């Protein structure tokens, strides 16, 4: 078998973290249009038979806590795991509403030795966020 | 008897390392728009990496920023697929 076993009773969780409004003291602008993203994802992964949970405007502490809790759920009947992050970012960093979170800290909860119910199962992180401030000028074809 | 603790992760990034990522205030982000569209179209026909490859092509060819600010006008984006997966991933049962 060259393909992951996807016929567990459940496809798995799809966590969508949708950060639109940030605390004023961060200086971060509101991410207009991200609700269109969150709704589109919700419906798309519903049709793929994922159990979608949309969360909105989470602090960096709420994000970390959410990932810890989700990593501690019973995933034994689930084929895979999906987490979508919609926020401001920089390289290796996603922003809570009140400050930054290391992407590594988020994904470490799901490491093969720390989330045993997901050992051997695909863990997908979909990240809509800046990775810096470079602009791609493109080249004509 | 063991697998790496880093195995079986995939990180679908909206943009290349070091780069801005583009979001349209009305249509949503270029990447999520394209990702949902390609999943809709191909989740029943294609392996996941080949779907994400279509997302790469859609973002790269069909999107270009329009801005009154010359610094930010006419810019492009390529998403970034980072795969530590050990097997093929199909969404159809």
């Amino acid at each position: 078998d060259n393909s992951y076993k996807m016929d567990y009773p459940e496809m798995g969780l799809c966590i969508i973290i949708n950060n639109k409004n940030f605390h004023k003291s961060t200086g971060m602008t509101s991410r207009s249009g991200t609700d269109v993203d969150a709704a589109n994802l919700r419906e798309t992964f519903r049709n793929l038979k994922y159990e979608v949970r949309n969360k909105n405007d989470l602090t960096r502490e709420e994000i970390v806590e959410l990932m810890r809790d989700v990593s501690k759920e019973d995933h034994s009947k689930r084929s895979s795991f999906v987490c979508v992050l919609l926020s401001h970012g920089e390289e290796g960093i996603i922003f809570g509403t009140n400050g930054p979170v290391d992407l590594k800290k988020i994904t470490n909860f799901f490491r093969g030795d720390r989330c045993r119910d997901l050992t051997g199962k695909p863990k997908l992180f979909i990240i809509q966020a800046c990775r810096g401030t470079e602009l791609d000028c493109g080249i004509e074809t | 008897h063991k697998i790496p603790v880093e195995a079986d992760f995939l990180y679908a990034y909206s943009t290349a390392p070091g780069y801005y990522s583009w979001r349209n205030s009305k249509d949503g982000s270029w990447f999520i728009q394209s990702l949902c569209a390609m999943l809709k179209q191909y989740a029943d026909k294609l392996e996941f990496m080949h779907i994400l490859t279509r997302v790469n092509r859609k973002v790269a060819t069909e999107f270009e920023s329009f801005s009154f600010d010359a610094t930010f006008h006419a810019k492009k984006q390529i998403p970034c697929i980072v795969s530590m997966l050990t097997k093929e991933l199909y969404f159809y049962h």
């Binding site: 991410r31 800046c130 | 801005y20 990522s21 583009w22 979001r23 930010f72």
Partner: peptide, 4 residues
């Protein structure tokens, strides 16, 4: 179009 805006930047994130």
């Amino acid at each position: 179009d805006e930047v994130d």
